[PDB]
Amino acid sequence: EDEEYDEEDYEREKELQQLLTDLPHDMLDDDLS
């Protein structure tokens, strides 16, 4: 009586992937003194 991932789910998971990629990665840069 239950289902899995539909289109809405996969689209959302993909938007997350793009969002986490756009995450500034130059904030994990070290040495700020």
Partner: protein, 222 residues
């Protein structure tokens, strides 16, 4: 001071997710703890030079340097803590790491913005209230094919055509086709219902001491 800029992250109820990248590996474990692992590459193999682990409520931060030659060998799960480790409260976190806690805070806030808290099935659409409260994102996928994306700032309509555009203000949405307002109002009623449903249920949850009452899936796709 940290807490000038940012508030302690909230990673409760979130699903386990790991994210590789050229610099570091940020993830959310099964215990809903946020782990940030700095990564360095040497001899065609990756090495870990620092691990930040933040509690589910974002109040407790543990940082350990497995300081050794070659650092830590990168695996698929966060490495066991060494002996030269540290633990601070959110307010007692040093001026260092502040750039990294803010990064982890954004990561979590992004994940919550794509994490369903309430799924509601109407006659015409699938409604989803997300986890990034307060003012969580609201997404409406009509079976008709139209998509509506509500933010605290935005309203975003994707017509069956694929014709997409954003409506920021109350005046902007009023500049409408008096037919698309049906999609607008039905979505807004679905948003009203979910916000109402969320409130009375989370109220009962404060009354209890049990497993989370979220996420919820209400009704079924017809």
């Amino acid at each position: 001071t940290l807490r000038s800029i940012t508030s302690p992250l909230v990673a409760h109820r979130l699903k386990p997710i790991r994210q590789k990248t050229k610099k570091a590996v940020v993830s959310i474990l099964d215990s809903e703890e946020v782990c940030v692992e700095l990564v360095k590459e040497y001899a065609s193999q990756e090495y870990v030079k620092e691990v930040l682990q933040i509690s589910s409520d974002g109040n407790t931060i543990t940082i350990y340097y497995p300081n050794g030659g070659r650092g830590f060998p990168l695996a698929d799960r966060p490495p066991s803590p060494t002996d030269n480790i540290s633990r601070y409260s959110f307010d007692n976190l040093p001026e260092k790491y502040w750039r990294k806690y803010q990064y982890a805070s954004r990561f979590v806030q992004l994940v919550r913005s794509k994490s369903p808290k309430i799924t509601y099935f109407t006659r015409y659409a699938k409604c989803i209230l997300m986890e990034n409260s307060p003012g969580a994102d609201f997404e409406v996928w009509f079976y008709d094919g139209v998509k509506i994306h509500k933010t605290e700032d935005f309203i975003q309509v994707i017509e069956k055509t694929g014709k997409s555009y954003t409506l920021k203000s109350e005046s902007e949405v009023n500049s409408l086709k008096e037919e698309i307002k049906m999609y607008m109002d039905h979505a807004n009623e679905g948003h009203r219902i979910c916000l109402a449903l969320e409130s009375i249920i989370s109220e009962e949850e404060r009354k209890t001491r049990s497993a989370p009452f979220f996420p919820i899936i209400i009704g079924r796709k017809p």
